Design a protein around this ligand. Structure first.
Ligand SMILES: CCCCCCCCCCO[C@@H]1O[C@H](CO)[C@@H](O[C@H]2O[C@H](CO)[C@@H](O)[C@H](O)[C@H]2O)[C@H](O)[C@H]1O
Ligand SMILES: CCCCCCCCCCO[C@@H]1O[C@H](CO)[C@@H](O[C@H]2O[C@H](CO)[C@@H](O)[C@H](O)[C@H]2O)[C@H](O)[C@H]1O
Ligand SMILES: CCCCCCCCCCO[C@@H]1O[C@H](CO)[C@@H](O[C@H]2O[C@H](CO)[C@@H](O)[C@H](O)[C@H]2O)[C@H](O)[C@H]1O
Ligand SMILES: Nc1ccn([C@@H]2O[C@H](CO)[C@@H](O)[C@H]2O)c(=O)n1
Ligand SMILES: Nc1ccn([C@@H]2O[C@H](CO)[C@@H](O)[C@H]2O)c(=O)n1
Ligand SMILES: Nc1ccn([C@@H]2O[C@H](CO)[C@@H](O)[C@H]2O)c(=O)n1
Ligand code: NA
Ligand code: NA
Ligand code: NA
Lengths: 404, 404, 404
């Protein structure tokens, strides 16, 4: 029943302790409160009636903004994003390149506008302030954690830019983990446009802030001593649209290559596996068979662990965008395998994060440009930070599955 | 009758004098001739029979070039830009992204070719030479004004690149105004592909050269003393296509964001306005109500001033591309409001310009790269230059409405 | 019969000798073996039964990879690349921008992956090693020649990057020729997706390695004395996709401009030619009339030389991508002119190369960045290198036509 979930949380906590740089340096107030916040946050917005209402209210607001932004892409691509497409091409009428990718552009512009107005800084200051006061974490790493709820791993540390070059190894590691444990507002709307429940996306985003700090301070406790704009609103929107455009082009090119490469891998795996009497061997079977214990450990039923392992594994070995692309058909009525609603939630939560190996190179560029003499430390702690970010997503998925 | 137009011109001239840096330094020959040229140019090509024939001849030639360039986009997007699209999606068969944006690429390549051959330099030298000889303006600012008829605000000063770092504040201001009062050959073909009459676009482009110098020397008179390539034609075309591609991507991303943001603004304005008994409140109503006196002042009928104010205002607070995108449906048979032909002309002329706040940042980058130690002056005169560019477009619209 | 082909080869060899920097410095072993290899390679894979089987086996493998990569573009553009497109738009259902361009992205990612694994370096080391041992050419220029079979003119010298700044003028010229005589794996799959026979593309690619060295050492004999990575596989794929994206955008923008410009040229040529009683004058007629002797010289029948001259000429004055775009309809059942299978082969081989004037500027950037103090030599030998690359493609076409 609920025993598998509580054991799941214990195992995830245990792995982080075993991989800690110094277990005797672990601050029990910090890691105790961080888990308490992430757990209570899950209890609040997924179990308690009032918290569920606030979550649905924020989600519907997000859903309304997406529809508003869709007027922009409707102007550019016209009938190619209309209802007539489904009458002609059926299911293939949904053109991903025109339906999902342009949303990255609009939300990037919106976020840039909200930064110019000071709305974002206002929310981050409140959330980040409450974290450091309750966990004892430093000012800079707390703000970066709160910022990571809404923006990406490279944009989040920008709110504490002048503090990055001199922050401790534990601080830098937490900053990295904050970005790896979360996603971004732009891609969130993209995943929502692909069928992923917004309530799960918003929840996992907020739970990433304490969850990121949790496993960061578990695996890399503080052993040192920490310390302590566009001309107008229209320029802000333009700059945001430009950054979103570049992102949309990068994501699209990645999806063409990766999905194409996976198809190539499956073709080769069919021939190689055939030598051992398994010609039906594919990448999905390997990932599913290898991540099934992990899926089962976080609350996925025994008969659904293998399928759930495919998506979780693909997110790890590649990225969450590719995983969501393969998981999205399982959210429609034309799903090859009908999954339970709890399993759908667990997969949604466990995928909601930038935790992968390729994100290390991105951290080296974005976060590294803020502190060029610290690129060595980023590369050194890269793998451990990904593991920490993975544990945070898995913990959030276990918590979500518990109250569901 | 015509009294409202002549008063309109007087008011526009009056505002520039009131905002002048030194009214006693205003050269009457310069500002007198500049207005005389812009007025006579309007009289020539919009009223006098022969001038109307030369305008239609140049416009049809432009219209033929656009159709020739459309063979390129027809090859890439095939049936998505064919007549079958209108049979399937109806009005939504016109895909803006494939119909308008690729034209920016072709014309950028063409202009680059005409620069390599020396055709552009030949025309600019004649027009720019006649301006300085009649107005007394300096050599450099005159060529940049003439160049601005065909190319953008950042490409126009390139013909006088080595003179920019040492030109006077009045010269630099005129260069800025020349770009803000005009558009570019690429986007001109785009607006033409959206339904805007080419005759109006060409006319307003040529009237921008004396009009730009007019309000530049009115608001910033000269108080100082002025002074005084690709390997082959195929490389020129390739470089032009590359620049046009980058432009086409920027415009498209901007249109997705801005239109999407306007839709978001309208949603919020509906809720905010509802608090004051106006739930139907939108961005269009605010702009229309605030720019109606300005539209009425330049010759737009009282019962059409509010609608015309929406487009003029949107061009100012954002850019002319967004304004044209909302004005284009009013040029078809399926227009929500049937406007008079004179009103259509006034709006077309008043929108034909890069005069907006975001163009300042663009001037800081493009024009600023030509003179890095002058970026301070560009930022300082930015707002006044936009105002001057706005007055030039409004003057051209008043002149156009007069002879129509 | 076969006398026209052998004379064709002799003429091509003769031109290179006449344009040599020093005919008395020509190494007979080098240029003798290089021609022997290119000729025997053609004999092997186009005439001899076993060699034809190995060619078809490699081609079908290439054809399978393309289909695998098409799963990526099928996900992004959905029904716009499905069979329904041909039912609605007929022949115009084939959208080039979604059918061909995305293939550049996938193959660029694949090649980047094969480089990370060491597969490419392994094949290049074998082919490049056999060339230098048989021709006496230096180590660096041999590897660059072999690398050019699979990758582009700017990516090929990267395998011998630290040797480029100090290599002789003859070596540098050979490196340039190796890239101009060949194409790239990405665009190869593009041309294959346009209808060009893969067997011809693969054959011409392999024949480019000895053919490139052949005319390089003929026109520029050695008179001096020669001398002598991503964090993971997923990062390699991402970087490749990014480079392919940039390439796909450049090619698409070029095709819009160039084809559009050709349409504009044809319009002007119709008016200019009309003055001399030839209003039907077009760019195709000029190129066909001027390259017909060259087409006839390499084995194209007298009544097909003019049509074949259009494609060969267009490849020279522009690029092979534009030429292939105009030659592709001649490979379908709806061809305006039914050509013989041998003529189709000759045109396919003669077009398979980056040999054009615009590739010089590209060599100045790519190859020049590897040796900034050698950009002068690259620009100096630019034209001769293009001629050499042209002769290599023409030789390969003559050889192909001989055994066919
Ligand atoms: C489409 C899906 C198909 C399935 C593909 C699965 C392949 C698994 C990739 C793992 O490769 C490793 O990843 C590390 C992470 O980058 C690299 O470490 C590199 O970076 C580390 C830190 O960032 C350092 O510790 C190392 O020294 C450095 O080698 C390491 O070299 C590399 O072997
Ligand atoms: C989609 C449409 C929705 C409607 C939106 C309308 C909003 C109006 C924007 C105006 O904002 C101002 O614009 C100036 C122009 O850039 C800025 O001046 C900045 O730049 C000037 C000069 O370029 C300087 O004088 C100033 O010091 C400097 O603040 C200024 O800060 C900013 O407040
Ligand atoms: C769409 C198709 C329409 C048909 C168009 C056909 C036009 C033919 C273009 C030829 O122009 C020449 O090309 C050279 C090659 O770049 C240039 O040499 C330049 O570069 C050379 C070496 O790279 C140097 O030798 C020269 O000094 C230098 O002028 C040269 O200037 C230029 O006149
Ligand atoms: N705003 C964003 C969006 C995405 N990303 C990177 O792209 C991968 C796929 O979404 C993510 O996993 C992440 O590596 C990013 O760094 N910042
Ligand atoms: N050639 C061009 C075209 C456009 N622009 C800038 O983009 C805005 C929208 O067209 C314009 O208002 C202007 O700011 C530009 O600077 N140069
Ligand atoms: N990988 C590639 C692909 C293309 N190119 C350049 O682009 C032209 C058209 O394919 C080619 O003729 C060549 O100039 C390149 O340099 N490298
Ligand atoms: Na984040
Ligand atoms: Na201009
Ligand atoms: Na090559």
């Amino acid at each position: 029943s609920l025993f598998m979930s509580c054991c799941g949380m214990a195992v995830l906590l245990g792995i982080a302790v075993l991989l800690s740089s110094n277990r005797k340096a672990i601050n029990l107030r910090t890691v105790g409160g961080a888990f308490a916040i992430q757990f209570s946050l899950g209890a609040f917005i997924l179990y308690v009636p009032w918290g569920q209402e606030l979550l649905r209210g924020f989600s519907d607001a997000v859903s309304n903004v997406i529809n508003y932004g869709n007027d922009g892409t409707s102007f550019l691509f016209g009938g190619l994003v209309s209802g007539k497409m489904f009458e002609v091409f059926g299911g293939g009428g949904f053109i991903f390149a025109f339906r999902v990718l342009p949303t990255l552009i609009f939300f990037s512009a919106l976020i840039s506008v909200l930064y110019y107005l000071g709305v974002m800084q206002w929310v981050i200051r409140i959330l980040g302030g409450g974290l450091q006061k309750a966990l004892g974490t430093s000012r800079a790493e707390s703000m970066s954690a709160a910022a990571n709820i809404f923006v990406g791993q490279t944009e989040a540390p920008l709110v504490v830019r002048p503090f990055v070059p001199k922050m401790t190894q534990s601080e830098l590691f937490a900053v990295m983990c904050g970005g790896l444990a979360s996603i971004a507002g732009g891609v969130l709307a993209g995943y929502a446009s692909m069928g992923v429940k917004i309530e799960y996306l918003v929840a996992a985003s907020f739970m990433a802030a304490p969850g990121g700090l949790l496993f960061a301070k578990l695996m890399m406790p503080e052993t040192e001593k920490p310390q302590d704009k566009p001309a107008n609103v229209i320029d802000a929107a333009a700059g945001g649209a430009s950054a979103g455009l570049q992102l949309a082009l990068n994501v699209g090119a990645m999806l063409i290559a990766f999905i194409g490469l996976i198809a190539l891998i499956n073709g080769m795996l069919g021939g190689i596996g055939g030598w051992f009497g398994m010609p039906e061997l594919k990448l999905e079977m390997l990932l599913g068979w290898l991540f099934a214990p992990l899926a089962f450990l976080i609350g996925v039923p025994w008969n659904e662990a293998t399928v759930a392992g495919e998506f979780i594994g693909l997110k790890t070995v590649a990225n969450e965008f590719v995983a969501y692309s393969q998981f999205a058909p399982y959210l429609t009525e034309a799903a090859p395998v009908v999954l339970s609603e709890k399993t759908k939630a667990i997969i949604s939560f466990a995928l909601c994060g930038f935790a992968n190996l390729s994100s290390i190179a991105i951290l080296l560029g974005g976060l590294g440009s803020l502190a060029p003499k610290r690129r060595g430390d980023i590369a050194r702690m890269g793998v451990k930070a990904v593991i920490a970010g993975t544990l945070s997503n898995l913990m959030a998925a276990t918590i979500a599955g518990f109250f569901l």
